């Protein structure tokens, strides 16, 4: 789970476009979503957590799994 390292982490995964939950000028605030051009990831904040994993949502925002740090699907 990262704050500012998350962007670079997601960028290194291809998810270049940080989409913040709020429009300008409130865009430094909140759990953001990172865009592939196809899918979206957000850092897995969960209790189990493991080590810096991701939740992924499809092009329609449907959740399509919990993922590890290299985007291998772990579970729902």
């Amino acid at each position: 789970l990262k704050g500012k390292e998350a962007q670079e982490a997601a960028s290194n995964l291809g998810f270049d476009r940080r989409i913040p939950p709020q429009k300008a000028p409130f865009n430094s605030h909140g759990q953001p979503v990172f865009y592939d051009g196809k899918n979206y990831i957000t850092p897995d904040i969960d209790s189990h957590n493991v080590t810096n994993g991701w939740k992924m949502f499809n092009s329609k925002g449907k959740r399509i799994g919990t993922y590890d740090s290299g985007l291998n699907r772990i579970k729902d």
Partner: protein
């Protein structure tokens, strides 16, 4: 059990005040950080009560928002979505995108949700959990007495 429950005091995360919480769907639970910049917890709970009422009444669906901001300044919100089929309730975790809406309003949340699917157009499994109708009723009733 089914529901969404507060843990401890609100804390600052990702640059804003959030309410640490959990959602429990029978044997599954997952930690959540409900942002408070627009809605307090009374607001979240009121919205869930209304949404549960609508969905329960006609056995369609109930979208439970777990983030909310000023609707005109909102790009997306996280929701947990309940689909009713007889005495079984399927639950999915869906992000609602509103970047190119402007029309959105929280009391209309159930209109922004469409019917249930289990796999997307690419064949990927949609994440899904389940719990019984009674456990959703109990959660609906508890909000109704709060």
């Amino acid at each position: 059990m089914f529901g969404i429950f507060s843990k401890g005091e609100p804390v600052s995360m990702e640059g804003e005040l959030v309410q640490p919480s959990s959602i429990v769907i029978n044997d599954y639970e997952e930690e959540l950080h409900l942002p408070l910049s627009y809605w307090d917890i009374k607001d979240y709970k009121n919205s869930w009560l209304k949404s549960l009422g609508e969905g329960l009444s006609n056995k369609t669906h109930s979208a439970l928002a777990v983030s909310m901001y000023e609707p005109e300044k909102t790009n997306f919100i996280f929701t947990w979505v309940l689909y009713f089929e007889d005495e079984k309730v399927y639950v999915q975790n869906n992000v609602i995108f509103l970047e190119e809406c402007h029309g959105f309003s929280p009391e209309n949340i159930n209109k922004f949700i469409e019917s249930r699917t289990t796999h997307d157009g690419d064949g990927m499994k949609i994440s899904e959990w389940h719990t019984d109708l009674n456990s959703v009723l109990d959660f609906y009733h508890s909000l109704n007495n709060a």
